[PDB]
Structure formats: structure tokens, C-alpha cells
Nucleic acid binder design. Structure first.
Ligand SMILES: [Zn+2]
Ligand SMILES: [Zn+2]
Ligand SMILES: [Zn+2]
Lengths: 171, 87, 112, 551, 178, 270, 107, 97
DNA sequence: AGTAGTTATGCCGGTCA
DNA sequence: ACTACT
RNA sequence: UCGACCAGGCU
């Protein structure tokens, strides 16, 4: 899953920053605008790699105000989830509708009726849990989830998964 | 494509700077000098942006590059440094 | 030989009046009228029928008709013409616009 | 401009893809259904009915409202809506092609009337260039008036091969008003070609046939010349013009839509009613009229859809037609800010390239200088100076895009600039400016001069720059444009300053000389007979500003 | 101000066709094996199993803090804190993601030896499997070839039960300890 | 109509004149690459005059007591008489001059010798003279090889086109053909010494300016040549306040229209 | 080449473009009485090896369509038996530059 | 005053690119519209406020630009559309050449 | 024939919904 | 008032 | 806020 994609970005530098430590200010701007960002297109952009050799190229000067626009060619580590992708993470929240597992920078949600049947919801617990003949899932338990579907949204991706198939559930 | 970037060698365009090029350099620099960008010469008391630009150009200290386009899309880059300034 | 005569004729019209126009000018006109192959008239029928962009052509003589036929035949405009840009409010590729300008991070450091 | 920040990346237009609207897209784009021909007054209540102008399109009443979009009128471009028509109608502007395409395809089956099987056709089919190809293809098979089912292959005219079927004879087509009529030929069989009919045949034309006939599968397929769903242009295109309240001020276009709207509703309520079959079609051609009249209203079939009062009604096409037109009079040229004009009169005391500017004008025309440590002082002086004294200023514009009006602002006297802010200051001595005299025949009708603010109300120019403009002082007027950017002015001073323009490339010689008084007199001052004594020679020397002080 | 990506296919207006993604190894167009490098050369998709990812990130944030000072001139539970520092030094501090990713990665990492990870990679990079599967097999603890072929349907016919079960064995060993 | 039909024609960075389609219209602007502002009418002496005076002017026969440079001109005047190695050059020179003369009479059949051409050479020499107060009394100090190989070398730099290849290089040589005739017409050994009386210094100077002044007269890629050309014709037609053949505005109209049924449609037969 | 006198059969010529490669050319007699190419205003043209052309295009970065065209029925075009695609090199005198070299592709 | 066709020519003649663009925009029209990257139309429903964009019908919400063109031109396009003609505006080229 | 398309630049009273 | 094209 | 159409006059 986790990928390393070759991306690029455009930055418009005011003329004031047309100093000597310019390359530095761009490389900075890049990281400010990219690391932490999210798109359904490339998923979560987590970390820009090889800081040292970020290609700045020659920026062209806009022609009415005097800013320049550089096309910063970088490379980075991204995280885009998928439907049918098996992933395991830790629990975070848990109600009567299901519980939310956290895989990486993202959060997956397991709906009650997407769990096995013999697995019940013990409300009269704390932290709230889900009990089975054998299992006891809750707040911090690690779980192996199958991502059933994703929903790209704003600055993040969210999905819903099940643990009703085989070899899925707590670990 | 950048398969359109004609090497510093093999350049065939004029070695000299065109009135248009230069008119546009002095103007661009003046603009940025007025935008409070860094100035690369000593303002011998100069305080007019175009003046400061003409001065930067006379001391070939203008960090700009003219990207000349050929009718096909090819292009040769020339620095104001390089470019002669007979005009 | 046509181009030759065409110039010769054009020239006479101007010299007959007792004026002088440096050859290159009439030359250029004369040539434009012939390059394509025969005699293209400085007329809505002649020149305004080449492959220049729709937008360019519509700025002379047959405006809407040209724009209509333009949508019918799904034309594509390069926006290489002075006119297209004037219409789009963009810097036209002429004199000051015949080339781009960039800050060279390199030389920008040698200066200090 | 068109203000307020937008996070959307900003680029320039590189290409323009022309095409035709598919009824589907029109429906897709549409933000509003549009059923009622009423402007608004929700039953007389000043507002807008969910029917015409703003059933969610742009706005009116200086009211951000605009189907959330908000932003308010200056920012909100229009928003298209639509009208599902009652029956397909031609597009006034395509009728000609619509017809010529029929004369190229076979009705009933929709296949070309000439294959590679015909050679004179292949020759055309090779012609690369939509325009000319379709030009041939037509002339070629316009005559072919039978959908031949079998042709003698490139072997012997003996064994004839098979292609497309149905040999149905082909109607000889002619145009009548906005109607296409054919006569399949003892004696012909005259009959009118219905739109729904022509539409279907076009829809059946094959994709390859499309193209061979200069069209395009993605951007402009034949069928689209036939309007089915009509795009409704937003308020901005057809803005009103109110007179306070309880009145009106609708636009011609807003009416012709109402016409179309009415005309449509009428038709439809005849197909859901007692449809006297050919009393309907009598009201269908009315729609064809309006929907045609709205785009073009200066056709050949004389009914020039006049409006109540006889005035013709501007068709959209009128809006774009040459000079004064949209294109020619709004884009290839337009009225502009920062310009000034007055009577001119020569002044034998200005330098060739100066331009005497009346103080009153110097105080109106302004330049947007940016606050720099280089000019903080000078600029603050001007701001404090005022918009009324001469060397002064009118506005101070802060980083936080807001104008401080130095003539009212309770802080006019106050104000302390800010590196980066801008002070719109008065035009001052030596500002480069474009000066011109119309008609503008050659470069030299527009040269850049140095300003010299001066008394009285007339632009004063040096006599020798007289010829280039072709001005005399019989009362000619001259225009003047003040450059606004740091580079804009650079372009003037560096490229078109009067001194540069001196030797003209028009006729490889100078284009300004010595004239009138100076010419007449320079001769006299020259004649061997002309002698000058000390007292005067001394003044004459002094008058020359460079004179090295050497008698 | 967006963020482009080494391949621009024509916007023939007809913007409709792009399927959904799945365990049919049908990731976006933005993730096909055949994708173009920044030096415009074809280069196979680069998927990373966890840990192999925890290393990649950590290494970069390191050489960063380094150059973030060349110009300055003029144990599972234990790594959690050691990393929480490198972060508040080279990261943006609001990268709640890169932080959460560093823990998640640090905790669920199967191999924590730049060598063991290499071993893993060589081992799998002989299967001829898709970068994604190779990624999953690497970061998902599997025993029966069944558990594998089941959490990774993409496989199924791509590798025999015994052969896949072999590699699985190997994987359970190179499986660095804690 | 003129302007609308040339809007988009401008000299490109390769010295080609094209429109907005990239279609060539003039391979080298004005068939010479020169900007019109930098041109002046100059006389090409070589073309006119009798063969009699042509020889008396440009001919230098070192192997002759009556056709050599008298030593009052050139310094090495006496020690040059009879030099066979030099007459090879002087004959090579006088051969070209004579070839030029025929080539000019070929281009300008008329015999007309005054034509607009870049770099005014008459002046560029007068300054040369006065700058160095060159006295027509003493003798020069120019090697007969000095002159000849210098002028020969000056040509090598009157660049208009640049590319490294034959098609272009040839184009270049074409572009400069007529100018060079002028050049040789004026920098002929005989003239240079008998007429101008230039010293070796004054000479190297004239050669330097002639070079610069040339490079300066070349057209600037960018120049909106189209519109310029349009207005340059239109403007004077405006002042046309009008041998009985349709002439003037009505005729011009006729022409631009490619008018099939022109009014006066004479035809002159020789 | 076939120099007819007062014309050829409207059925006869229907047999010229029928024996390729080899091509046939028809010419009227009265049309060749005077040689046009010899006319004052007519400059020297010149065919160009498919290579000489490929070079012309390469050295000027031209597409074919960017070259000044000449009519297939242009007098001088026929005189040299030009064929759609070939390029002539027109060389003429110049009151500006002595000699100038232009190119014309065949339509 | 009117900087008309003829004065436009004179600027082209001087080769004064910027001064022309500035005279036809900054000094007159100039407007900011948002276009779709799929269909070159001014469809996009920009809500510069909540940072939302979108162009249903193309169902876009990501591929969107903003361009500066003379209001008269926005009009020219909307008018051309009203007449069922699509004058798509694209920020990148394809036709190369 | 029939069929349309133009025509210089720019600036400065009086009826109609 | 004139001029070309379908 | 602010338009259209017509007609007339100056260069
Ligand atoms: Zn809106
Ligand atoms: Zn049929
Ligand atoms: Zn869209």
C-alpha cells in the first residue's frame, strides 16, 4: 500500500524573497503546502523525501506583478487506501453503531452489523466494548480490518470496513 | 518536452540583446526593485527603481534570463550577463 | 513573375504621388498576397479565409458567421495571433512579448 | 480585479476549443429549470419568480443572494439555465449547413451518397481540411439523387458490388423561410422536411461519415445544429435598468426569451390537448421563428420581428457585428481609465519630447507608486500635501486592499505610510506618458513625451513633433494615456519616446524637421548679408542651454 | 497551488469512464505499474510494506535535520520517543498525520533492521508479483497460504500454495524480533 | 484591411518573417535582414562610369612604372614595384571589383547607382579623417596586404544570420552580397590610399565602426514588421490628393482587391 | 511529353494517369512558341532532391505547410514538370540585398 | 477616452506588449472568472469563502483554474453560448506544433 | 441572375419602456 | 455607391 | 445605478 510517488508543485514567489537564500524559502514553502496535505488523487502526502535534491528549475516571472513561478519537482511518501485492501490498526472510538480503527494517518470505521453476529456490543462497559464467546474488542485493541469502501473528504480519506470475513478480527 | 531546450552550445540567436528584450528587462527589474526586492548594486544615491535597474544592467548584475522562443517551440536561454548591449 | 509585377504596380501607385516607401514594406505586402500560391486579395474573401484562428478572423468583416462555422467544425485556436490575445487580455507575443523571463537562482547568488 | 482572493491556480488561456452544445450538456450546466415567462414579482411582490431571470441564475437587487455562490453581483459571473423546447427547431445560423448536409447523406438510412467506390469521391475524401473537404464531398454527391445499393467495383463495370441498401430516391431540396422542402421525382412529390425528421437522419449519420463531412465526434456532431434544449443566458447578459422601485427596465433579450417561453408553452399545451394535427404545426413554426429571431433577426425572409413600437429588437448576433460591435468595439478597442483630452497649441519653449500638461489635468490623472524606503518621505509629503494642492495625491491603498480617500478620510492629515502600501499620486514633471492624435495612422501618431505640468488649459507640444501626429492648431484635440505599472512606463520611455521615433523606418529617413517660423527664420539668419552685433550675439549665445560660455 | 503528477492524458471533455479500485489490483491511473519517473523514464510502481516505510520516512527526516543545520551555520517503545523528537525538529508540527503515521508505523513494523528489510525485499522480489501484493505480504502476518490468498485475493493463482507457503515461512524468520 | 491582413507578421528569433501560423513569408526580413531606420541612400560607384575611369580608379599594377602606387602614397611604395607575389592579390582584388561591376549592372539594369543600404560609409570615413587629422601630404603606412586582407576580413563579420550549416551560411552570404559590393567599391587599395589617404590607424578604425554600425542596423527579433509595413503604405495613401491610366487611391483599391476587370488595362510591348 | 496542336480528345487524355510509375505531360504548341522562363520578370527556379528538401525543412524547422506554395499548374511549375510535394528554390536579384533565395513547395 | 482599433495597431507597431495589455485590462475591463479544466466553460460555481468550487455536470471539484480576461470577453463567451456555441477555454495546449 | 456585405477616427438634442 | 461571390 | 434608437454638428 504506502507509496512513493513522483509529484510536482507550483509556487509563486513574491519579488521581495528574490534574495540569495531563495532556494531555501521555496523548499520551505513546498513542505508547508505539501506535507500533511490530502487529496483523493494521491491520498495522504506524508513526507517529502530527499530534501537536498529537490529540483527547483528556473522560475518564470509573471508579467504584471513581478512574482516568479517555479515548478518544484519533488518526490514523496504517500498513503492512499483502497477498497478490498486488508489493513490492521488500533481501535480509537467505539459506540453502539460500531467502532473506529486507526490505520496510519487515516481512520476506518466498522459498522456493528459488519462484524460477526456472535459479537455483541457491551454498552455497560468502560471503556465501552464488543464481546464475543471468545473475543473482547475495545478502545486499544489491535484489529485486522478489510476496507470495504472509501470516501475522500476535504483534507483526509475515510473508509468503512468489516471483520466478518475470515482471518479478520482481533489479533 | 525540454527536448526543446537548445544547449548553451549550438545557440544560434543574436549574441546581442534586442531593444525589446532590454526594454523589458529594465522594466521587470524596476518593477521588482519597487516591490522592495533585493538590489544588486550600490545605489550611488539612486532612489528611482528604473534608475536602479539601468544601473544594475550597466553592471551586468541582473539575475534574469531571457528565454528566446523559436517559431517551432524550441528555445535558447541567454543571461543578461552574456547578452551584449550595443543598442 | 506575378509577384514581380504586383510589386511593380503597387510601387507605382505610391511613387506616382511623389512619395517614397522603403521597399521592404511593399515587398512584405506583395509577398503575403502570393506565398499561398496565387493572388490573395486584401479582402474578406481573400486573406480572411486562411487558417488563422477563428477569433482572429472574426475581428474583421464576417464576425458571427466565422464564429458560427467555428463551432460547427470544432475549430481550435492557438491563440498565437496578436488578436486572440488582445481579446483574452493576455500579453501578446510581440516585441516585449516575443520571449520569456526568468530569475536564475544561480547567478542570483554570485551577486553578493 | 473582480476582487477577493481565490485559492484556484491562475493560468492563461492557451487554446480555444470551439464546438456545439449537446442538449445533454446544456441540461448539465443549467442551474435552473425556467418555466414561467414572468420576470418576477412573486404575484406582484417585488422579488423573482422561480421561472425567468433567477430561478437561481445570477442576481439583481444588490443582493449577495445567488444560490449560495453569493459573492454578490461584482464577482458572480452569470449562471446558465435552460428551456426544454417542445419540438426540435433549426439553429438560424446552421440552416444552410443543415441543408447541405442532407444533400450529402441519404434520408431514411443516413449514409453517405458516395463511397471510396466512387473515385472522384476518394479524391475528395483525401482532401485534408474540413472546410474544403466538406466543400468537395457536397458538390460531389449533391447531385447523386439515389441511395445506390450496388456499384461497379474497381474491376469491371460488369460485376457490380454491394454496399449500403435502400435506394429510396433522394429529394431535391430547396429552402423556404426557416423551412426545408424537398420534391422526390410523372411529376414530383413536393413535401416539407420536418425537423424531428432531419434530426433523426443526422443522428443516424455514422461517426466516420461525420468526420469525412468535416464534423467532430466530441465537440460538434451534426445533430447538435438542431436545437432541442435551449441555453438561457443569465442576468448579466440581459441586465435590466430600474428607476428606483415600482417600474421596470427589462432587456430585449429578456423579452425574446419570454416570447420563446410563451411560444413554447403554447405548442406543448396543444400536444397534450385536442391536437388539430396541422394547426399545431402552425404554432410550431412560431417557436422556430422566435428561437431563430433571438439569435439572428436580420434574415432574408423579411418578417423582421419588430417589437411593440416598431423597433426591431437586437438579436444576439447584432451584438457582435462589426464596429460598435462586441468584438470590434469592446475588445479590439475600448474606452479606458486614466486618459485625458483637450485642445492643443504649440509652444516654442518645450523640448521636442516634452508635453505641456494643464495643472487641472495633472491633478486628476494619477500614478500608483509603491511605498519604498526610497520614497517614503516624498510620498508622505504628497499624501499630507493633499489632492488639491498640486504636487499631491488622491488615494492611499493599504496592503489590506482598501482605499483611503484623501479628500474625505478623517485621517487625511494623519496617515503614516507603510513600506508596501501604495500612494496614488498626481502626475508629475517628467512622468512618461503616451500622447496621440487621431486618426492614428503610423507608430508616430502615438509617441511618449515627458510631462511638464503647466498653467492654462491646453496640451502644449513642441512645433517639430507637429508633423508626426499631423496636428495644426486650428483646434485639434489630442489624447493622453498615463501608464500604470513600473514596466508599462519602461516600455514607453525605452521603446516609444519621441526622440527614438525621430528617424522613421517607413521611408528610411527622419520624420520630424524644422518648420514655420524657425524654418522661415533660420534661412534669413543665414544669408551672407546677415550680421549680428555683440549685445545680441550675447543673448543668442545665452539662449542655447549648452553653450560652453565661450564667446 | 495544486500538485501535478508525471503524466497528463488528454481531457477529451468526455470525463466519464474511470472504474472503481479494488483487490483486482485496479488502483487509480495514478498508481499503475507502468508509471513515468521525473527523468521521464518508465519505472515500476513503488509500494512500500510498513516498516520499509518507517525506515524510508525516518531516513529522510534525518538527512533533513542534517541539511537543516548545514545551513544552520550561517527498541519499539523506545523508538516512539526518539522519533517524536526528530519530528519536532524537521516536521511542520501540525503534520498530525506524519506523527500518527510514525507511531502506527513504529508499532506495527515487522522488521526494524535496514538489513532484515533488505532480505525481505530480495525474498519477495523474485515472485514476479505486483508491487502491491509484495507490499502486503511484507507487512501482513500470514500463516496458511490460505490466510494470505484470502487477505490478498490478488494472489490466488499467481503463486502455488506450497511456494507461497514457503516464502511465508521465510518471512516468519527474517521476521525481526522485538 | 491592410493592417488586419498583416497584424501577426513579425521577425522571429531566427531572422525569418512569419505569421501566426509559423508559415514563412520572407526568409530574411526585407530580403536583407536590415531594420529600415538604419538605412541611407549610398552611391555604388562601381556600377556607373566608363570602363575607362573604372580602371583609372581601382587599378593597381605593381608590375608597371605607370600603374603602380606612387611611393608618395604608400610608404613601402618603392620596395613594392615589381613584386610578383602582391600583384597576385592586387589582381585578385581588381578581378572581384570588375566582377561586382558586372553583377551590379545585372541587378540594376537601369544603371541606377544610388540605393538605400545599411552603414553609411562615406561619413564613417570623414570622421576617420578628422579624428586623426590625416594629412594628404605624407605617405600612409598600410601594407598593400594590410588593406586587401583587412577589407577581405571585415566581410567575414558582417553577420546577419548565424547557424552552423550550409543552407544558413549560404543565406548569410546572400544577405550581404549587395552591401559588400559597396564595401569593396569604397575600400579599394587605390582609393584607400590615393583618395582617402588613410593611415594604418584610421583604417583599422573605419573597419571597426563599419562592423559595429552594421550589426546595429540588423532587425530586432520581435519587431512587428507586419503592422509596420501596413501603416507604411496606408499612411501615405491617406495623403493622396489626386499618363492616362487608373492611378492613385482608385488604382490602389483596384490592386488590393485583385480586381479582375480593372479600368485602364494597357500593356507595353518592346 | 506530348505536344498536341489544337487539342486532344476528352477521351484521349482519360488514359494519361493510367500507366504509373511513368507519367505523361500534355503541352499546346502555341504555348511553347515563346519560352516564358526567358522572361525578364521570371527568376531562376530549381528542383530539389528529396534530400535537399528534407534539409530545407530541417534547417528552418518548418512543417511542409509552412512553406510558400507554387501552383501545380503554375507556368514555370509545368516547365520543370514539378510534382505535388517537390520544392523549387527560387533565386532572384534584390534591390535590397543583391541576391535573395526563396523556396516554393508544389501544390 | 477610447483607445481604439487604430491605437491598438500603433502599440503593436511599437512592439509595446505590456502597455497594450495594461491599457486593455487594468485600465478598463479586467475580470476574474473560474473555469472548468474539463470543459472550457465558465460553469464552475466558486464560493471564494468556504473555498468550495465544483462544476456539476462535469462533476468536478478539483480540476479548476481562474483566469483574467476582459469582462467584455466573458460577455462574448456567454453570448456565444446563448447561441449554442461552446467556446471552451483551456489553460494548457495539446495541438503542440 | 440572386444574394450578400462594406463603407474613417474620435468627440459633442429628442422619443421609448 | 460599389463590388464580389453563389 | 444607468440604456436604446434616431437625427444633427465639429476634426
Ligand atoms: Zn453566482
Ligand atoms: Zn439510404
Ligand atoms: Zn465543467
Amino acid at each position: 500500500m504506502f507509496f512513493i510517488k513522483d509529484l510536482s508543485l507550483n509556487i509563486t514567489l513574491h519579488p521581495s524573497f528574490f534574495g540569495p537564500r531563495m532556494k531555501q524559502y521555496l523548499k520551505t514553502k513546498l513542505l508547508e503546502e505539501v506535507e500533511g496535505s490530502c487529496t483523493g488523487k494521491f491520498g495522504y502526502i506524508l513526507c517529502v523525501l530527499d530534501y537536498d535534491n529537490i529540483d527547483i528549475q528556473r522560475g518564470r516571472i509573471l508579467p504584471t506583478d513581478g512574482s516568479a513561478e517555479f515548478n518544484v519537482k519533488y518526490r514523496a511518501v504517500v498513503f492512499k487506501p483502497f477498497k478490498g485492501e486488508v489493513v490492521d490498526g488500533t481501535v480509537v472510538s467505539c459506540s453502539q453503531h460500531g467502532f473506529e480503527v486507526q490505520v496510519g494517518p487515516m481512520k476506518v470505521f466498522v459498522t456493528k452489523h459488519l462484524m460477526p453476529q456472535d459479537l455483541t456490543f457491551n454498552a455497560g462497559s468502560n471503556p465501552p466494548s464488543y464481546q464475543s464467546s471468545e473475543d473482547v474488542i475495545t478502545i486499544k485493541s489491535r484489529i485486522r480490518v478489510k476496507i470495504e469502501g472509501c470516501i475522500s473528504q476535504v483534507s483526509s480519506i475515510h473508509a468503512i470496513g468489516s471483520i466478518k470475513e475470515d482471518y479478520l478480527g482481533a489479533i | 518536452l525540454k527536448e526543446k531546450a537548445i544547449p548553451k552550445d549550438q545557440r544560434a540567436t543574436t549574441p546581442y540583446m534586442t531593444k525589446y528584450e532590454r526594454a523589458r528587462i529594465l522594466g521587470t527589474r524596476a518593477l521588482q526593485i519597487s516591490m522592495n526586492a533585493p538590489v544588486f548594486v550600490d545605489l550611488e544615491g539612486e532612489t528611482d527603481p528604473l534608475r536602479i535597474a539601468m544601473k544594475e544592467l550597466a553592471e551586468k548584475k541582473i539575475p534574469l534570463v531571457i528565454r528566446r522562443y523559436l517559431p517551432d517551440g524550441s528555445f535558447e536561454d541567454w543571461s543578461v550577463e552574456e547578452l551584449i548591449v550595443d543598442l | 513573375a506575378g509577384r514581380a509585377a504586383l510589386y511593380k504596380e503597387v510601387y507605382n501607385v505610391i511613387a506616382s504621388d511623389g512619395s517614397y516607401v522603403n521597399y521592404r514594406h511593399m515587398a512584405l505586402l506583395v509577398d503575403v498576397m502570393t506565398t499561398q500560391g496565387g493572388l490573395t486579395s486584401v479582402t474578406r474573401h481573400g486573406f480572411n479565409r486562411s487558417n488563422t484562428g477563428a477569433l482572429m478572423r472574426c475581428s474583421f468583416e464576417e464576425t458571427v458567421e466565422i464564429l458560427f462555422e467555428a463551432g460547427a467544425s470544432a475549430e481550435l485556436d492557438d491563440c498565437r495571433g496578436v488578436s486572440e490575445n488582445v481579446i483574452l487580455g493576455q500579453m501578446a507575443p510581440i516585441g516585449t512579448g516575443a520571449f520569456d523571463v526568468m530569475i536564475d537562482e544561480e547567478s542570483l547568488v554570485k551577486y553578493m | 480585479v473582480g476582487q477577493q482572493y481565490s485559492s484556484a491556480p491562475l493560468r492563461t488561456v492557451k487554446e480555444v476549443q470551439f464546438g456545439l452544445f449537446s442538449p445533454e450538456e446544456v441540461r448539465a450546466i443549467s442551474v435552473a429549470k425556467i418555466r414561467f415567462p414572468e420576470t418576477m414579482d412573486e404575484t406582484q411582490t417585488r422579488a423573482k419568480i422561480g421561472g425567468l431571470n433567477d430561478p437561481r441564475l445570477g442576481s439583481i437587487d444588490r443582493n449577495l443572494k445567488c444560490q449560495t455562490c453569493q459573492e454578490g453581483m461584482n464577482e458572480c459571473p452569470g449562471h446558465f439555465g435552460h428551456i426544454d423546447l417542445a419540438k426540435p427547431v433549426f439553429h438560424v445560423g446552421f440552416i444552410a449547413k443543415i441543408k447541405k448536409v442532407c444533400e450529402c447523406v441519404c434520408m431514411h438510412c443516413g449514409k453517405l451518397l458516395l463511397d471510396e467506390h466512387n473515385e472522384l469521391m476518394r479524391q475528395a475524401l483525401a482532401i485534408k481540411d474540413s472546410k474544403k473537404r466538406f466543400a468537395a464531398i457536397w458538390t460531389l454527391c449533391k447531385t447523386k439523387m439515389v441511395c445506390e445499393t450496388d456499384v461497379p467495383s474497381e474491376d469491371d463495370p460488369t460485376q457490380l458490388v454491394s454496399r449500403g441498401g435502400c435506394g429510396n430516391t433522394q429529394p431535391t431540396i430547396r429552402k423556404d423561410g426557416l423551412k426545408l422542402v424537398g420534391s422526390w421525382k410523372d411529376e414530383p412529390e413536393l413535401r416539407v422536411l420536418s425537423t424531428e425528421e432531419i434530426l433523426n437522419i443526422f443522428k443516424h449519420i455514422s461517426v466516420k461519415d461525420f468526420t469525412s463531412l468535416g464534423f467532430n465526434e466530441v465537440f460538434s456532431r451534426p445533430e447538435w445544429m438542431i436545437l432541442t434544449c435551449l441555453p438561457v443566458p443569465p442576468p448579466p447578459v440581459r441586465p435590466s435598468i430600474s428607476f428606483n422601485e415600482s417600474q421596470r427596465g427589462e432587456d430585449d433579450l429578456t423579452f425574446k426569451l419570454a416570447d420563446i417561453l410563451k411560444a413554447n408553452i403554447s405548442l406543448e399545451t396543444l400536444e397534450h390537448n385536442g391536437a388539430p394535427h396541422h394547426a399545431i404545426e402552425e404554432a410550431e413554426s412560431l417557436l422556430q421563428f422566435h428561437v431563430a429571431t433571438y439569435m439572428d433577426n436580420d434574415i432574408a425572409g423579411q418578417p423582421q420581428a419588430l417589437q411593440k413600437s416598431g423597433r426591431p429588437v437586437k438579436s444576439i448576433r447584432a451584438r457582435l457585428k462589426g464596429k460598435e460591435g462586441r468584438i470590434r468595439g469592446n475588445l479590439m478597442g475600448k474606452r479606458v481609465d486614466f486618459s485625458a483630452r483637450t485642445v492643443i497649441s504649440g509652444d516654442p519653449n518645450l523640448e521636442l519630447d516634452q508635453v505641456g500638461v494643464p495643472k487641472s489635468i495633472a491633478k486628476t490623472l494619477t500614478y500608483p507608486e509603491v511605498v519604498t524606503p526610497y520614497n517614503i518621505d516624498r510620498l508622505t509629503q504628497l499624501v499630507r500635501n493633499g489632492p488639491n494642492e498640486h504636487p499631491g495625491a488622491k488615494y492611499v491603498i493599504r496592503d489590506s486592499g482598501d482605499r483611503i480617500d484623501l479628500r474625505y478620510s478623517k485621517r487625511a492629515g494623519d496617515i503614516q505610510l507603510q513600506y508596501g502600501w501604495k500612494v496614488e499620486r498626481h502626475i508629475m514633471d517628467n512622468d512618461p506618458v503616451l500622447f496621440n492624435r487621431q486618426p492614428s495612422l503610423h507608430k508616430m501618431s502615438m509617441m511618449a513625451h515627458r510631462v511638464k505640468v503647466i498653467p492654462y488649459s491646453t496640451f502644449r507640444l513642441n512645433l517639430s513633433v507637429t508633423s508626426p501626429y499631423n496636428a495644426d492648431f486650428d483646434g485639434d484635440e489630442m489624447n493622453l494615456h498615463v501608464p500604470q505599472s513600473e514596466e508599462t512606463r519602461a516600455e514607453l520611455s525605452q521603446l516609444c519616446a519621441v526622440p527614438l521615433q525621430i528617424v522613421s523606418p517607413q521611408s528610411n529617413k527622419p520624420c520630424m524637421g524644422i518648420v514655420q517660423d524657425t524654418l522661415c527664420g533660420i534661412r534669413k539668419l543665414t544669408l551672407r548679408d546677415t550680421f549680428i552685433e555683440l549685445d545680441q550675439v550675447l543673448n543668442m549665445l545665452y539662449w542655447v542651454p549648452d553653450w560652453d560660455g565661450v564667446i | 497551488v495544486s500538485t501535478s503528477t508525471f503524466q497528463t492524458r488528454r481531457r477529451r471533455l468526455k470525463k466519464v469512464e474511470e472504474e472503481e479500485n479494488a483487490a483486482t489490483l485496479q488502483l487509480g491511473q495514478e498508481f499503475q505499474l507502468k508509471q513515468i519517473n521525473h527523468q521521464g523514464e518508465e519505472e515500476e510502481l513503488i509500494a512500500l510494506n510498513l516498516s520499509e516505510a518507517r525506515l524510508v520516512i525516518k531516513e529522510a527526516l534525518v538527512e533533513r535535520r542534517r541539511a537543516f543545520k548545514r545551513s544552520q551555520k550561517k527498541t519499539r517503545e523506545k523508538e516512539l520517543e526518539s522519533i517524536d523528537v526528530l519530528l519536532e525538529q524537521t516536521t511542520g508540527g501540525n503534520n498530525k498525520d506524519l506523527k500518527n503515521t510514525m507511531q502506527y508505523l513504529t508499532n506495527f513494523s515487522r522488521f526494524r533492521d535496514q538489513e532484515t528489510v533488505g532480505a525481505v525485499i530480495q525474498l519477495l522480489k523474485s515472485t514476479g508479483l505486483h508491487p502491491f501484493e509484495v507490499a502486503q505480504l511484507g507487512s501482513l502476518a500470514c500463516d496458511t497460504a490460505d490466510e494470505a490468498k484470502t487477505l490478498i485475493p490478488s494472489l490466488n493463482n499467481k503463486i502455488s500454495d506450497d511456494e507461497l507457503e514457503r516464502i511465508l515461512k521465510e518471512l516468519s524468520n527474517l521476521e525481526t524480533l522485538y | 484591411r491592410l493592417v488586419k491582413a498583416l497584424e501577426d507578421i513579425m521577425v522571429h528569433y531566427d531572422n525569418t518573417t512569419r505569421n501566426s501560423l509559423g508559415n514563412v513569408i520572407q526568409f530574411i526580413y526585407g530580403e536583407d535582414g536590415m531594420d529600415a531606420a538604419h538605412i541611407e541612400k549610398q552611391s555604388l560607384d562601381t556600377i556607373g562610369g566608363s570602363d575607362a575611369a573604372f580602371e583609372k580608379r581601382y587599378r593597381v599594377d605593381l608590375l608597371n612604372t605607370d600603374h603602380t602606387l606612387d611611393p608618395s602614397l604608400l610608404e613601402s611604395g618603392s620596395e613594392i614595384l615589381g613584386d610578383l607575389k602582391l600583384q597576385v592579390l592586387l589582381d585578385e582584388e581588381y578581378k572581384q571589383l570588375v566582377k561586382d561591376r558586372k553583377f551590379l549592372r545585372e541587378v540594376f539594369v537601369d544603371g541606377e547607382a544610388n540605393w538605400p543600404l545599411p552603414v553609411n560609409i562615406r561619413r564613417i570615413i570623414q570622421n576617420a579623417q578628422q579624428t586623426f587629422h590625416i594629412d594628404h601630404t605624407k605617405p600612409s603606412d598600410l601594407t598593400i596586404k594590410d588593406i586587401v586582407l583587412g577589407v577581405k576580413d571585415l566581410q567575414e563579420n558582417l553577420l546577419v544570420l548565424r547557424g552552423k550549416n550550409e543552407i544558413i551560411q549560404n543565406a548569410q552570404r546572400d544577405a550581404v552580397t549587395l552591401f559588400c559590393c559597396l564595401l569593396r567599391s569604397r575600400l579599394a587599395t587605390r582609393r584607400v590610399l590615393q583618395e582617402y589617404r588613410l593611415t594604418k590607424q584610421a583604417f583599422d578604425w573605419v573597419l571597426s565602426n563599419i562592423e559595429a554600425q552594421f550589426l546595429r542596423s540588423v532587425v530586432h527579433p520581435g519587431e512587428m514588421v507586419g503592422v509596420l509595413a501596413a501603416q507604411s503604405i496606408g499612411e501615405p495613401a491617406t495623403q493622396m490628393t489626386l499618363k492616362k491610366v487608373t492611378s492613385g487611391v482608385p488604382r490602389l483599391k483596384e490592386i488590393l482587391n485583385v480586381a479582375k476587370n480593372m479600368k485602364t488595362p494597357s500593356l507595353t510591348v518592346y | 511529353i506530348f505536344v498536341y496542336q489544337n487539342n486532344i480528345t476528352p477521351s484521349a487524355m482519360k488514359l494519361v494517369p493510367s500507366i504509373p510509375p511513368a507519367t505523361i505531360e500534355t503541352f499546346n504548341e502555341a504555348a511553347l512558341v515563346v519560352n516564358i522562363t526567358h522572361h525578364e520578370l521570371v527568376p531562376k527556379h530549381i528542383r530539389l532532391s528529396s534530400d535537399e528538401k528534407r534539409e530545407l525543412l530541417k534547417r528552418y524547422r518548418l512543417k511542409e505547410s509552412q512553406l510558400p506554395r507554387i501552383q501545380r499548374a503554375d507556368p514555370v511549375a509545368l516547365y520543370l514538370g514539378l510534382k505535388r510535394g517537390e520544392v523549387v528554390k527560387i533565386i532572384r536579384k534584390s534591390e535590397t540585398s543583391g541576391r535573395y533565395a526563396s523556396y516554393r513547395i508544389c501544390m | 477616452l477610447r483607445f481604439g482599433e487604430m491605437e491598438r495597431d500603433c502599440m503593436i507597431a511599437h512592439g509595446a506588449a505590456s502597455f497594450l495589455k495594461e491599457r486593455l485590462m487594468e485600465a478598463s475591463d479586467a475580470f476574474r472568472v473560474h473555469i472548468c479544466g474539463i470543459c472550457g466553460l465558465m460553469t464552475v460555481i466558486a464560493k471564494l469563502n468556504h473555498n468550495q468550487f465544483e462544476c456539476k455536470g462535469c462533476d468536478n471539484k478539483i480540476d479548476i483554474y481562474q483566469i483574467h480576461i476582459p469582462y467584455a470577453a466573458k460577455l462574448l463567451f456567454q453570448e456565444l453560448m446563448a447561441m449554442n456555441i461552446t467556446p471552451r477555454l483551456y489553460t494548457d495546449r495539446s495541438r503542440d506544433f
